Structures are given as C-alpha cells and as structure tokens.
Amino acid sequence: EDRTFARVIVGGSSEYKINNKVVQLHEYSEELEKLGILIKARNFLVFQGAVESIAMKNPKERTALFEEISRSGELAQEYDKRKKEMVK
DNA sequence: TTTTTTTTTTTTTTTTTTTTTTTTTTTTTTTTTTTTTTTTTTTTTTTTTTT
C-alpha cells in the first residue's frame, strides 16, 4: 500500500491532508507518532551550521530534548501540582 | 730629574623615588529571575461568491 500525506497553506493557517482528505493537525500527528517521529523533539535534522551547536549547548536544552522523546513532558503539571499540595 | 699643583675617573654612600606585594575594602559588570509585551498564528463567525 501507499500513503499520500499533504499540507496546503491558506491565509495564515495551514491544513493537512491524509489520503487526499482534509484532516486536522492532531490526528495527522498521531499517525506520525505511530510511524516513529517526534516533530517537536527535533532530533534528526541538522541545518547548515548546527552540527557544532549540537555539542556546545547548555546542558538544560539537551535534557529538554531527552525529556521530550521519552513522553515524560506531559506529566509535568501533575508533578508540580502534587508538589505544591504536599509542601503546603 | 724631581717636586708641586691640577683634573679626570672610579667607587661608595645616601636619599628620594619608584616598584612590588599583599591585604582589605568597594563598587560594577555580569548573571539569573520574573514579567510581560509583542507579534504571529489560530479560530470562528461573518461576508462574499458560486451553482
């Protein structure tokens, strides 16, 4: 089988297509997440000059990336809400 | 030739200045936080247009 993804831009907004049918960003995203690519992570693209700036980042940004890939960023609000409650 | 007198060089002493070194104090750029504003993007209703 063969899949045809698309994305057309209108005005300011952008619309996504699956199998030549208009879809919303979230479901398209979820399909990609099934395929195995975390677009917000940005761990597999390297532009003109960033191959150096892969190494010299401040460690926090690298931790951010490693937290992003690992599906442990969604559990943030849960964490610090529990934190504030228990410290209170 | 020898004796007497003058002048230049060398070297030591001293005094003033300079340099050094640390220490303590001070005040400043640097670094982080928070906010927060802007701008871009988004949505949804309205408007326009088409069959």
> What gap in Å lies between CA A43 and CA A52, rounded to an integer?
14
Torsion of CA A83, A84, A87, A88, to 10 degrees: -150
Beta bridge partners of A6: A17
Q: Quick one: which of A50, A26, A52 has its CA closest to A40?
A: A26
**What single letter denotes the amino acid at residue A20?**
N
Q: What's the CA A11/C1' B38 distance, rounded, in angstroms?
A: 21
Q: Quick one: which of A75, A74, A72, A78 has its CA closest to A86?
A: A78
> What gap in Å lies between CA A73 and CA A61, rounded to an integer?
13
CB < 7 A to strand B: residues 8-27, chain A: 11-14
**Residue A46, Cα to own-chain centre: how many angstroms?**
16
CB < 7 A to strand B: residues 29-48, chain A: none
State the resolution, in angstroms: 5.3
| Chain B positions with any atom < 7 A from a protein CB | 40-44
The experimental method is cryo-EM
